[PDB]
Design a protein around this ligand. Structure first.
Ligand SMILES: Nc1ncnc2c1ncn2[C@@H]1O[C@H](COP(=O)(O)OP(=O)(O)O)[C@@H](O)[C@H]1O
Ligand SMILES: [Cl-]
Ligand SMILES: [Mn+2]
Ligand SMILES: [Mn+2]
Length: 442
C-alpha cells in the first residue's frame, strides 16, 4: 500500500507488490536493482526486469553482466530476462504465452505510455492472483503531488517565463548560459521550432523524441553539445551531464472526443510526477552544487479523459490471462477510465490485425483498434482515403496527397482521424507511407 525506501527480501514473496520511491538519483536503477536481482537469483525465482527504453535496457545489460541476465530485443530459474516495457506488452499480445515469471521488476514505473500502463495492470493482476511478486521502482508513483522531491545536490528552482516559440530578442538568460541545458517541450513540432532558434544562435542542439530516442540519445554521451530539446520521453531514466533544466511545464494530451476521433489538447500543465522527473534530470551529482531548474508554470493532475489509459484497456482486453479473465489496471490508475472491462476484446483474426497495425503500421492504439474492429485487413489501406471531408489531412495548408501502390494519386482523408498521425513532419511522413502501402526500413 504505502511506498518504501529500502529493499528487503520479504518483498519477493508471492502476492507482494511494493513501490520503491527513493528520490531521483538515489540509486534505484544502478544500486537497488542489482541487489534485488542478486537476491532473486539466489532464491531461484523466475524474474523479468522491465526497462522503459532500449537505451536504459542496454545500460542495464552492461551494468548486469557477470550476472545471468538475458537482454531480449523482442530461462527458467537460471536466467533473468530483461526487456523494455513495450516489448513485454507486445509479447503478451502474441499467441505464444509469456513465461510465468513469479517476480516482475519494473523500472521507471511512472511511465504513462499505453504499453507501460498495460504492463502494470497485467503485473498487478498476476500479483493479486497470488502468482507473482512485483516491485515498481519510481520516485513519482501515480498520484504524487510533489513537484520538488529530494535530490543528491540542492537544486536552484526559479519560476520564469519560458519561450513557447522562436524568439528574435530577449530571453538572453537562455543563450548566455555556458553549461549544458535540457529543455522539455510539449511536442516534437514545438521542439523543432525551439531547436531551430537555438541553432540559429550558434548552439549545438540535440533533439529527442520517442521515434528518434535510441539513435539521438547516443549523441548526448559526448562533450560537444549545448542543448538537448526533448519531449517527455526523457522523464524515463534519461541520464544527462547537464547543469540546467528549462521546463515549459507543458504537455499535450491525446483526447478521444465522443469515441469518434483523437485530438491533441493543449499545450496544458504537466502532472506533478512529470515536473518532478523533468527537474530530476539535474542535481544528480552529490558533489556538484548549483544545478538550476527554470520552470514556466504550474502543475495539474491528469483528467479522466487522457487517451492513454483507455488505450491501455484496449491492450489489456486483448491479453490472455487465465481462461476468461481480463487483467485490471493497476488500482491507483484504474479510476482514469470509464471503459468497461472486456469491451475492447477482439476475435482472433481482428486481434492479429490490431497488433499488426500497431507494430508494423506504427499506428496509435486507438486508431489501430478502430481499423481492426471494422474488419479491415492490415494491407487494405482504402480507409486512409474515404473519410469525411473534415478528416482531410493538411500538409502546408494544402490537402496532403499520396500515390497509392495501385497507381492513383489520392487525398489523405482517413475514415478515423487520430491527430497523432499528422502532428509533425516525421509522423505525417510515416502515415503517408503507410497510406501508400509502403514501409520504411527499420
Ligand atoms: N554511467 C554512470 N557512471 C557513474 N554514475 C552514474 C552513471 N549513470 C548515473 N550515475 C549516477 O548514479 C547515481 C544513481 O543513479 P540511478 O541509480 O540512475 O538513480 P535513480 O534512483 O534515479 O534510478 C546518480 O548520482 C547518477 O548521477
Ligand atoms: Cl515523443
Ligand atoms: Mn539522498
Ligand atoms: Mn532510475
Amino acid at each position: 500500500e504505502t511506498p518504501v525506501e529500502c529493499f528487503e527480501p520479504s518483498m519477493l514473496k508471492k502476492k507482494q507488490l511494493t513501490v520503491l520511491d527513493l528520490h531521483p538519483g538515489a540509486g534505484k536503477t544502478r544500486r537497488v536493482l542489482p541487489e534485488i536481482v542478486r537476491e532473486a537469483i539466489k532464491t531461484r525465482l523466475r524474474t523479468v526486469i522491465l526497462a522503459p527504453t532500449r537505451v536504459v535496457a542496454a545500460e542495464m545489460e552492461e551494468a548486469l553482466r557477470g550476472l545471468p541476465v538475458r537482454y531480449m530485443t523482442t530461462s527458467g530459474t537460471e536466467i533473468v530476462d530483461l526487456m523494455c516495457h513495450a516489448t513485454f506488452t507486445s509479447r503478451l499480445l502474441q499467441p505464444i504465452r509469456v513465461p510465468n515469471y513469479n517476480l516482475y521488476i519494473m523500472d521507471e514505473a511512472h511511465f504513462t505510455d499505453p504499453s507501460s500502463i498495460a504492463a502494470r495492470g497485467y503485473i498487478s493482476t498476476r500479483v493479486e492472483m497470488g502468482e507473482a511478486a512485483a516491485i515498481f521502482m519510481t520516485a513519482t508513483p501515480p498520484g504524487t503531488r510533489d513537484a520538488f522531491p529530494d535530490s543528491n545536490s540542492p537544486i536552484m528552482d526559479t519560476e520564469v517565463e519560458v519561450p513557447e516559440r522562436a524568439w528574435s530578442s530577449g530571453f538572453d538568460w537562455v543563450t548566455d548560459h555556458s553549461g549544458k541545458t535540457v529543455w522539455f517541450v510539449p511536442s516534437v513540432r514545438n521542439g523543432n521550432e525551439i531547436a531551430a532558434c537555438l541553432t540559429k544562435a550558434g548552439k549545438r542542439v540535440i533533439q529527442l523524441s520517442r521515434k528518434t530516442f535510441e539513435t539521438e540519445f547516443q549523441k548526448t554521451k559526448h562533450q560537444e553539445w549545448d542543448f538537448v530539446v526533448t519531449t517527455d520521453i526523457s522523464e524515463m531514466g534519461a541520464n544527462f551531464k547537464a547543469d540546467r533544466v528549462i521546463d515549459s511545464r507543458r504537455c499535450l494530451k491525446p483526447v478521444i472526443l465522443d469515441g469518434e476521433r483523437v485530438i491533441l489538447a493543449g499545450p496544458m500543465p504537466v502532472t506533478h510526477a512529470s515536473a518532478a522527473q523533468r527537474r530530476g534530470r539535474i542535481g544528480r551529482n552529490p558533489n556538484k552544487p548549483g544545478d538550476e531548474y527554470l520552470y514556466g508554470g504550474g502543475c495539474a493532475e491528469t483528467d479522466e479523459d487522457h487517451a492513454h489509459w483507455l488505450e491501455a484497456r484496449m491492450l489489456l482486453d486483448n491479453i490472455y490471462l487465465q481462461d476468461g479473465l481480463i487483467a485490471s489496471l493497476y488500482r491507483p490508475e484504474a479510476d482514469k477510465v470509464a471503459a468497461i472491462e472486456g469491451e475492447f476484446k477482439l476475435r482472433t483474426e481482428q486481434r492479429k490485425t490490431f497488433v499488426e497495425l500497431m507494430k508494423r503500421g506504427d499506428l496509435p492504439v486507438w486508431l489501430a483498434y478502430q481499423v481492426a474492429s471494422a474488419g479491415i485487413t492490415y494491407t487494405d489501406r482504402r480507409w486512409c482515403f474515404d473519410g469525411t471531408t473534415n478528416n482531410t489531412i493538411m500538409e502546408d495548408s494544402v490537402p496532403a496527397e499520396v500515390w497509392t501502390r495501385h497507381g492513383e494519386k489520392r487525398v489523405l482523408k482517413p475514415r478515423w482521424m487520430d491527430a497523432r498521425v499528422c502532428s509533425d513532419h516525421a509522423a505525417l511522413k510515416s502515415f503517408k507511407e503507410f497510406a501508400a502501402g509502403k514501409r520504411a526500413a527499420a
